[PDB]
Design a binder for this molecule. Structure first.
Ligand SMILES: Nc1nc2c(ncn2[C@@H]2O[C@H](COP(=O)(O)OP(=O)(O)CP(=O)(O)O)[C@@H](O)[C@H]2O)c(=O)[nH]1
Ligand SMILES: [Cl-]
Ligand SMILES: [Mg+2]
Ligand SMILES: [Mg+2]
Length: 295
């Protein structure tokens, strides 16, 4: 139980008179680990990476001050932020994560109420005056262009023709699309069903992981709601939510999701380059072949 011991130590060291009586791992990413401490607190942690926890903390603070909602989000009680180590702690939001299986046991009315809850939460968050967090802007198109330049400066010339063509074909679509020219607002920006918590009546009770959140295209928060995969509910779910949300071009939302999805293998390669992780470069290149050959 080595990781747990270390992180217990660090929590007690940086947070005076916080006492860890229990601690377990409840989640992880490639760069992070989350712990449930005293069956009450979530502690999210990471070591040296590529101002992440600073922003996420600022966003929680901004949202807890400004949202009027019964939906719970993390409320940061402990933080330690440095280049080499960042920790955020908050009381665990209780509930059951939404999944496709759970959704399929819900009555039609239950499903509608959950969809309305989501639409309402997104309408309220996207309608906030974000002046107070105006530094948290994210420009996805410009980010992609910069990543493309990094590719050109590093490994692009060693890729295969098939890989190059996939990339260039994406860049050509990026240049022709209009889906980055619409409304910008504060978005969750990783808005998948594994971040949505339900209460005992299958209503939306909490939303977690605003770690990628920022001021960005309004379309961003529909990308997973529109996704047809084993992990998400399905395209009709996102469509209905978009109709409830109102005043948004559904076809552009879908175009934006389709473009993000096409980018994925390239995003994966770029992550590998930036983090010096060859396995990610390989995985993304292989995925380009998988997509190219899908019939
Ligand atoms: N019940 C519950 N689970 C939570 C809460 N906060 C985090 N979790 C659990 O911890 C996991 C990791 O938290 P999360 O913020 O998503 O992770 P992360 O550090 O951003 C890494 P990634 O972005 O890949 O999710 C979640 O998937 C979930 O299982 C919370 O308040 N309530
Ligand atoms: Cl490789
Ligand atoms: Mg997460
Ligand atoms: Mg996250």
């Amino acid at each position: 139980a080595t990781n747990v011991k270390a992180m217990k130590y660090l929590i007690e060291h940086y947070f005076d008179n916080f006492k860890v009586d229990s601690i377990e791992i409840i989640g992880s990413g490639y760069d992070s680990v989350a712990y449930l401490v005293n069956n009450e607190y979530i502690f999210k942690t990471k070591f040296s990476t590529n101002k992440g926890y600073a922003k996420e903390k600022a966003i929680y603070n901004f949202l807890n001050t400004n949202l009027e909602t019964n939906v719970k989000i993390p409320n940061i009680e402990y933080s330690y932020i440095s280049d080499e180590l960042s920790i955020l702690g908050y009381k665990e939001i209780k509930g059951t994560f939404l999944t496709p299986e759970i959704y399929s046991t819900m009555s039609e009315e239950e499903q509608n109420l959950l969809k309305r809850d989501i639409a309402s939460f997104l309408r309220q968050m996207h309608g906030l005056d974000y002046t107070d967090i105006s530094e948290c802007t994210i420009d996805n198109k410009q980010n992609v262009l910069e990543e493309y330049i990094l590719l050109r400066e590093t490994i692009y010339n060693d890729l295969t023709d098939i890989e190059k063509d996939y990339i260039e074909s994406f860049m050509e679509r990026l240049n022709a699309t209009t889906v980055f020219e619409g409304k910008k607002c504060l978005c969750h920006n990783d808005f998948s069903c594994n971040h949505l918590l339900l209460d005992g009546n299958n209503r939306l009770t909490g939303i977690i992981d605003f770690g990628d959140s920022g001021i960005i295209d309004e379309y961003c928060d529909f990308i997973y709601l529109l996704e047809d995969s084993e992990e998400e509910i399905g395209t009709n779910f996102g469509e209905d939510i978009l109709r409830m949300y109102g005043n948004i071009d559904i076809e552009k939302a879908k175009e934006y999701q389709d473009i993000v999805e096409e980018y994925y293998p390239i995003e994966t390669i770029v992550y590998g380059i930036k983090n010096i992780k060859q396995e990610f470069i390989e995985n993304g290149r292989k995925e380009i072949y998988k997509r190219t050959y899908k019939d």
